[PDB]
């Protein structure tokens, strides 16, 4: 299994550049030069790279400094052939963002935050990014009385709609992808799950160009089914981007390599990305982006091993998911379990409520005890899927 | 503290009628006669009662039997003065619903399920119910390959839109309230949280009369902030009903008395229901419905004690939440923390993106280190709230 | 990868006999006869069967019927050759056990529960069981003031030590195994995890014959590492029996097939039972017991599929972990990461604390920053196990 | 409800000195001088202060500087009268401890870590500490094959017993207290809950002087009942110190003020430390230590508010639990529910197992169905505690 640029594996600069500082310790690794990250990822098989404005250009950087850094980074891009599919803003590390960016209680800070995003749209547009991600990690609270909850969502709408309006005004081919997370760093974050993000988008003035960026570990931190959430995002045609990593349970965000967390759930996520829905439906077409952190125990040899593991994991799952659905044994098991039956509409062509309530076959003379005897055989179909994942089939 | 019918405390027949059977044991209590439940709840101070079609009318009941049961139950209602604000359908206890009602893989079962709901709308309309709740508890899976996830949501939309269309056709004053739950009885349930429910409603043909019925313990089973979720439902004006109970953590659904689970979260939920948003916004106006289960350890003396505890808990929280917001000390603390500041729009009247990006005060000459010095004093405001809850203030 | 009696795969009569009632529904399958259970399990390759007293002998049976059911049961064991390695008592279904068996607040229920256990030890010895399991499912509370916590533990001690002394007194060749569970059906169960259960055994009078009976899903309900937990039971030489199944997250007890929950942890679980410790130490030589429940969506064909599936899953995993450890590239990776290094004692033969303190190269002259540079290469080691698991190596 | 030195409220130098860096951001407050820390804590009513070696003495300090910082530190203790009841070692921040202290895979880090601890025991004795705490924060793994689990426990044993033997050898009047934590910063920490820690102490050579140091939030991260856990530590007479704070659910370690997390459980926690057991038994007479972190949104005024808040919270709760138990209606409710009944032994003075077995009224002639009718009245008992807690009784 070898990743080729056609696989569309993208990595953020902060992923392999994650230095190791956590809540109980300092960094264990030296800073990564951005120029080296670009060359290194291109040798491993990356398609692209992504970044936060402050991953690249320091918060306090002067003008002279900004142009050097960009000169150096466009050089590298040109030399290697890597693309920049997504760009994001850091509205969480500086102490100024302690209560949030867009939903800070201080109005002057909300204004700085939105200014910092607008300037960043320009840069994203100049880099040729298709997607603009917003992760509001400081948007929320520890305490329930800290916020006016309706005001927090109005403030949130103000900023996303101003950023969308500007995109439209400037003529840029960028779509905004919002990224939900339940907790960490705040005790509770606003728009905690895929569902909250999707609901919020519908209340937006310019929601037409606003969609989601779900992350595997983030949905797993609330104990949800990551494959079920992306399937609701796909169905509403709002799956604009995706962040892939691993998580081993409800606890702090681990950011492990994709496949190094819940393995069967990873298998089924690859299946949906690659095979789509069993009865047909929309298909995800974008970057396969890995937002993980090489464990702090490992040196730089581990950093490039970890980057590699992400694409290997993904290609190994892909080989198994294609084989799985290709197996005639699996196709038969699927039909038996009613997987294609689910796709037939419940009512008949031009049948109304009234029409169905009256049908005696459907209700009054329906033999419920008889219908309850069907052996759905879900266990057998799940055993078949695991045997294809373990490659023993 | 005494509940008066003006408090609008409603109870389901299955709550106080919950008999005690759980996964490792049989019932510890005898069945509750519905006639007695109605008299008993009226003596305790209830405003109303709610039920599932099969709580009242048995699955196999004959026609003669159906009329006796309804004759008996309308008599009781007439005698006591209790109202029926909500009615729901049982699409989960009979073995026929083992794979769901609306999203069963078997098409004949989907048809029976929808027939069973349509007939139930009629009954709800005849009882004078304002709300029709749908809790799809068997909608989901244990295994990731069991379902065509897009087909599952299409099937789900079919049934809710057919039920809504019929309401409209018949002229009934009923709104549908969907009720999310992450898991139990299925390993994963479709539309797991408030956010998923809200997102789904937006894809509906007749979503105008479809809203939510959040339950305290259900959002807490995913570790979410129940007050934050109802605040997103309120903001989108989709909070049609509410189920109040307690839950002590991420585990099986406990259905404890309201206030017998996370106490501070209960305080803040009462605050939002009774005081609304600090800067103004929509207010919830419906029944305060308790969907709990009197612990199986307790006899019928405990059943009526438990029903009573629900309304006492609620009135005790209400007394404290009104006092809390009335305290001048709290009002000052709120302003200091920026709670009213959050309500001022971020941009100025007729200010555009461009206009803000250019403002030098807002970005380029913004002193971020200076702004980061503000002491939000969230801890102090949270200490003030707890002292009002403990009534030591 | 056909199990054979040599494999020591045991199954409980209540697993395959589980008819499907969950908290929101009734059974979906017909009762399973125990004679049918023995013949069917023996044709699939099981080595033995386990049961709870009331799984075979009804709570109400007269002596006549007890002896009648036992004769057909022993006949069936005789005809097939299944052994009966473990026996347990039901101290949870009947309404009398609503507050517990051994720790019921009511003294007359504690005596009845203890008498129930003592007569069950006589049947255990009669059957040839080597292990007598105690899962205290109703020992706990929903509310914190429901119990005196010190007295609850004196009452658990008194029952376990009384049962242990009787074993010793009659000269039975039996060991008691406790089974920890965090919750379900009590809100909080006493002795909730493997650790609690090991600590408790150290306060017993008859501790020498008391060990543990850990269950996969039970530790996963508290978010703990199942492999770490049994490691700790094994290291203390208290792993006397084991219950294997699947669980997908912190939620209600799912009891899936082993391998249908956290797959990667199942792999590492099989690795420790099968291979033991890398540097050598204790090993678990007991039966491999499956304590699961066939999903309720499935007929009797799914029941036997499910039972097959347990055995397959364990042999598939078994094979990959033998190949994993035999692999020369894995053994070198292990060496690099320090797995064998941890095997060496920290202090030198004869080195005292005073000695180590005084060794300038261990402390005053140690280069803490040079030592921090080591690449432990845990990501690569982890990536090697997963390729062995996916059957790619 | 003004704390006074008599109350035994202790605070760590790292709590109030916690500057705010979390995983997505830098400090938001200036460093706090330790002399300032002692004076400020002494004006608020603290009885003592605790610290980690590196909280006071930098990792790099020369001997000259160590002695210089200690002289100003002891001066400040002298001027104020604060005691120093517990001392601990930092075996987690420096990059060298990336795989652990005592259980690092690297042997030279195990020796360096142990030497670090041994010299810290000399400082502990010098200060007048009675307790030496060990939180093994980096002892664990992210991946299951990273460690040999039996060897990890031999290496934890060897370090704890070496430290214990040295204490005994020097005649220091010190006790070691272990502090369990399920995760954060390792994916899985060794000795994850109170039980694991108690079981482990029973395999030690020097067990007699080793006890526990449970922390509220740490058990709440595994979803366990904090009151049940310390009950079990207390019952085994292993509760040697206690760390109190707040946690709102299974998620990252929040370290809130005690009482700002699970309020009802805090009440019951205060009830056991303060009142002990209803039928009598052990009592915890040690210091009440607050191991928390002032939220990063707040200035230095919030830091002192937060510290005040800990003490207030505990005295408010203290008052309500003294009133709760003194109340004649609560004592009658306790009697009805069987709280004192559980205090009586199950067997009669002199009754043997054979005797109980043979008593027809305890088993053969027992009316299990009449006994199942008892109303335990646990809901009312629970409702009485909450009205005492809300200060309504
Ligand atoms: O939880 C942290 C988030 O996952 C970020 O890495 C974003 O994806 C981009 O700000
Ligand atoms: O989890 C069970 C649900 O809460 C039901 O009680 C509904 O509210 C109505 O079907
Ligand atoms: O959660 C249920 C427990 O696992 C029981 O099945 C015991 O193993 C047998 O009483
Ligand atoms: O989670 C962190 C632990 O609580 C530590 O603060 C120990 O108590 C002291 O090393
Ligand atoms: Mg992300
Ligand atoms: Mg409900
Ligand atoms: Mg079991
Ligand atoms: Mg601590």
Short mmCIF file of C-alpha atoms in Angstrom, two decimals, chain C residues 79-275:
data_model
loop_
_atom_site.label_atom_id
_atom_site.label_comp_id
_atom_site.label_asym_id
_atom_site.label_seq_id
_atom_site.Cartn_x
_atom_site.Cartn_y
_atom_site.Cartn_z
CA UNK C 79 -24.65 -38.33 26.34
CA UNK C 80 -22.48 -35.42 25.07
CA UNK C 81 -19.56 -35.26 27.51
CA UNK C 82 -19.91 -31.52 28.31
CA UNK C 83 -18.36 -30.64 31.67
CA UNK C 84 -19.91 -28.13 34.14
CA UNK C 85 -16.93 -26.02 35.29
CA UNK C 86 -18.71 -23.15 36.98
CA UNK C 87 -22.02 -22.75 38.80
CA UNK C 88 -23.63 -19.51 40.07
CA UNK C 89 -26.69 -18.36 42.04
CA UNK C 90 -29.40 -15.98 40.90
CA UNK C 91 -29.58 -13.28 43.66
CA UNK C 92 -31.15 -10.66 41.39
CA UNK C 93 -34.40 -11.51 39.52
CA UNK C 94 -37.01 -12.27 42.11
CA UNK C 95 -38.63 -9.16 43.65
CA UNK C 96 -37.21 -10.14 47.12
CA UNK C 97 -33.70 -9.16 45.95
CA UNK C 98 -34.74 -5.58 45.03
CA UNK C 99 -32.22 -4.16 47.60
CA UNK C 100 -29.63 -6.97 47.27
CA UNK C 101 -28.96 -10.48 48.55
CA UNK C 102 -25.95 -10.26 51.02
CA UNK C 103 -26.30 -6.48 51.52
CA UNK C 104 -30.13 -6.08 51.57
CA UNK C 105 -31.08 -3.53 54.27
CA UNK C 106 -33.63 -6.13 55.53
CA UNK C 107 -31.93 -8.82 57.69
CA UNK C 108 -34.36 -11.61 56.79
CA UNK C 109 -33.47 -11.19 53.03
CA UNK C 110 -29.73 -11.41 53.93
CA UNK C 111 -30.27 -14.82 55.65
CA UNK C 112 -32.55 -16.12 52.85
CA UNK C 113 -29.91 -15.01 50.26
CA UNK C 114 -27.03 -16.65 52.18
CA UNK C 115 -29.08 -19.90 52.68
CA UNK C 116 -29.80 -19.81 48.91
CA UNK C 117 -25.99 -19.65 48.20
CA UNK C 118 -25.06 -22.38 50.70
CA UNK C 119 -27.42 -24.97 49.15
CA UNK C 120 -26.09 -23.95 45.67
CA UNK C 121 -22.51 -24.75 46.82
CA UNK C 122 -23.80 -28.32 47.54
CA UNK C 123 -25.12 -28.53 43.92
CA UNK C 124 -21.85 -27.00 42.56
CA UNK C 125 -19.72 -29.67 44.28
CA UNK C 126 -22.20 -32.39 43.01
CA UNK C 127 -21.80 -31.18 39.37
CA UNK C 128 -17.98 -31.11 39.38
CA UNK C 129 -17.65 -27.29 39.15
CA UNK C 130 -14.18 -25.98 40.19
CA UNK C 131 -15.47 -22.39 40.37
CA UNK C 132 -18.46 -20.86 42.17
CA UNK C 133 -19.08 -17.28 40.82
CA UNK C 134 -20.75 -14.46 42.72
CA UNK C 135 -21.99 -11.46 40.75
CA UNK C 136 -23.70 -9.13 43.37
CA UNK C 137 -25.93 -7.37 40.81
CA UNK C 138 -28.39 -5.72 43.22
CA UNK C 139 -25.81 -4.87 45.90
CA UNK C 140 -25.70 -1.06 45.81
CA UNK C 141 -27.89 2.00 45.70
CA UNK C 142 -29.48 4.72 43.49
CA UNK C 143 -29.15 7.33 46.23
CA UNK C 144 -26.14 8.05 48.44
CA UNK C 145 -27.92 8.02 51.80
CA UNK C 146 -29.71 4.67 51.15
CA UNK C 147 -26.94 2.68 52.87
CA UNK C 148 -24.34 2.82 55.62
CA UNK C 149 -21.23 2.13 53.39
CA UNK C 150 -19.07 0.60 56.15
CA UNK C 151 -21.95 -1.80 57.21
CA UNK C 152 -22.63 -2.72 53.52
CA UNK C 153 -18.97 -4.03 53.31
CA UNK C 154 -19.22 -5.80 56.72
CA UNK C 155 -22.38 -7.51 55.37
CA UNK C 156 -20.61 -8.46 52.02
CA UNK C 157 -17.64 -9.82 54.00
CA UNK C 158 -19.86 -11.87 56.33
CA UNK C 159 -21.67 -13.52 53.43
CA UNK C 160 -18.52 -14.28 51.33
CA UNK C 161 -16.55 -15.63 54.38
CA UNK C 162 -19.50 -17.68 55.57
CA UNK C 163 -19.71 -19.34 52.10
CA UNK C 164 -15.89 -19.87 52.02
CA UNK C 165 -15.73 -21.42 55.48
CA UNK C 166 -18.50 -23.90 54.50
CA UNK C 167 -16.50 -24.84 51.34
CA UNK C 168 -13.41 -25.44 53.54
CA UNK C 169 -15.55 -27.29 56.14
CA UNK C 170 -17.08 -29.74 53.60
CA UNK C 171 -13.76 -30.26 51.78
CA UNK C 172 -15.24 -29.19 48.42
CA UNK C 173 -12.65 -28.53 45.71
CA UNK C 174 -14.17 -25.12 44.84
CA UNK C 175 -12.97 -21.55 44.58
CA UNK C 176 -15.21 -18.50 44.80
CA UNK C 177 -14.82 -15.86 42.08
CA UNK C 178 -16.27 -12.34 42.53
CA UNK C 179 -17.59 -10.37 39.56
CA UNK C 180 -17.32 -6.59 39.67
CA UNK C 181 -19.74 -4.31 37.75
CA UNK C 182 -19.93 -0.51 38.02
CA UNK C 183 -23.70 -0.11 37.52
CA UNK C 184 -26.75 -1.80 35.92
CA UNK C 185 -29.11 -2.73 37.56
CA UNK C 186 -28.25 -0.57 40.60
CA UNK C 187 -27.28 3.07 39.92
CA UNK C 188 -23.97 2.28 41.79
CA UNK C 189 -22.86 -1.37 42.46
CA UNK C 190 -20.51 -2.19 45.40
CA UNK C 191 -17.04 -3.43 44.22
CA UNK C 192 -17.46 -1.69 40.84
CA UNK C 193 -14.18 -2.51 39.07
CA UNK C 194 -11.45 -5.20 39.13
CA UNK C 195 -9.41 -3.15 41.69
CA UNK C 196 -12.24 -2.79 44.25
CA UNK C 197 -12.84 -6.56 44.08
CA UNK C 198 -9.07 -7.32 44.63
CA UNK C 199 -8.82 -4.88 47.58
CA UNK C 200 -11.97 -6.35 49.19
CA UNK C 201 -10.58 -9.94 48.97
CA UNK C 202 -7.59 -8.78 51.13
CA UNK C 203 -9.91 -8.03 54.13
CA UNK C 204 -11.51 -11.48 54.10
CA UNK C 205 -10.91 -14.12 56.68
CA UNK C 206 -10.92 -16.84 54.01
CA UNK C 207 -9.12 -14.86 51.28
CA UNK C 208 -7.00 -17.75 50.06
CA UNK C 209 -9.86 -19.37 48.15
CA UNK C 210 -11.45 -16.12 46.85
CA UNK C 211 -10.43 -14.65 43.45
CA UNK C 212 -12.05 -12.72 40.61
CA UNK C 213 -14.31 -13.16 37.59
CA UNK C 214 -13.72 -10.02 35.41
CA UNK C 215 -15.99 -9.33 32.49
CA UNK C 216 -14.87 -7.38 29.34
CA UNK C 217 -17.87 -5.04 29.09
CA UNK C 218 -18.07 -4.44 32.84
CA UNK C 219 -14.67 -2.68 32.92
CA UNK C 220 -15.40 -0.95 29.60
CA UNK C 221 -18.59 0.63 31.23
CA UNK C 222 -16.18 2.60 33.52
CA UNK C 223 -13.91 3.38 30.50
CA UNK C 224 -11.05 1.21 31.85
CA UNK C 225 -8.47 -0.85 29.93
CA UNK C 226 -9.65 -4.45 30.14
CA UNK C 227 -6.09 -5.79 29.45
CA UNK C 228 -4.59 -3.61 32.18
CA UNK C 229 -7.22 -4.82 34.69
CA UNK C 230 -6.82 -8.59 34.10
CA UNK C 231 -3.02 -7.94 34.01
CA UNK C 232 -3.37 -6.68 37.62
CA UNK C 233 -5.65 -9.62 38.60
CA UNK C 234 -3.13 -12.05 36.98
CA UNK C 235 -0.07 -10.37 38.65
CA UNK C 236 -1.85 -10.83 42.06
CA UNK C 237 -2.70 -14.49 41.12
CA UNK C 238 -6.40 -13.83 41.55
CA UNK C 239 -7.61 -14.40 37.97
CA UNK C 240 -9.71 -17.54 38.68
CA UNK C 241 -12.27 -17.39 35.83
CA UNK C 242 -13.03 -14.89 33.00
CA UNK C 243 -16.23 -13.67 31.31
CA UNK C 244 -15.65 -12.52 27.61
CA UNK C 245 -18.03 -10.46 25.43
CA UNK C 246 -18.22 -7.12 23.63
CA UNK C 247 -19.12 -3.56 24.51
CA UNK C 248 -19.07 -0.47 22.33
CA UNK C 249 -18.54 2.41 24.83
CA UNK C 250 -19.78 3.72 28.17
CA UNK C 251 -23.49 2.97 28.04
CA UNK C 252 -25.84 0.15 29.11
CA UNK C 253 -24.39 -3.40 29.20
CA UNK C 254 -24.60 -4.63 25.60
CA UNK C 255 -23.13 -8.17 26.03
CA UNK C 256 -22.18 -8.48 22.32
CA UNK C 257 -20.09 -11.27 20.88
CA UNK C 258 -16.42 -11.12 21.93
CA UNK C 259 -14.72 -9.12 19.12
CA UNK C 260 -17.88 -7.15 18.13
CA UNK C 261 -17.00 -4.39 20.64
CA UNK C 262 -13.47 -2.90 21.05
CA UNK C 263 -11.53 -5.02 18.51
CA UNK C 264 -7.94 -3.83 19.12
CA UNK C 265 -8.44 -4.34 22.95
CA UNK C 266 -9.85 -7.86 22.24
CA UNK C 267 -6.60 -8.63 20.28
CA UNK C 268 -4.43 -7.58 23.30
CA UNK C 269 -6.81 -9.45 25.61
CA UNK C 270 -6.28 -12.67 23.56
CA UNK C 271 -2.48 -11.97 23.50
CA UNK C 272 -2.25 -11.98 27.38
CA UNK C 273 -4.40 -15.12 27.89
CA UNK C 274 -2.64 -16.94 25.09
CA UNK C 275 0.97 -15.58 25.24
#
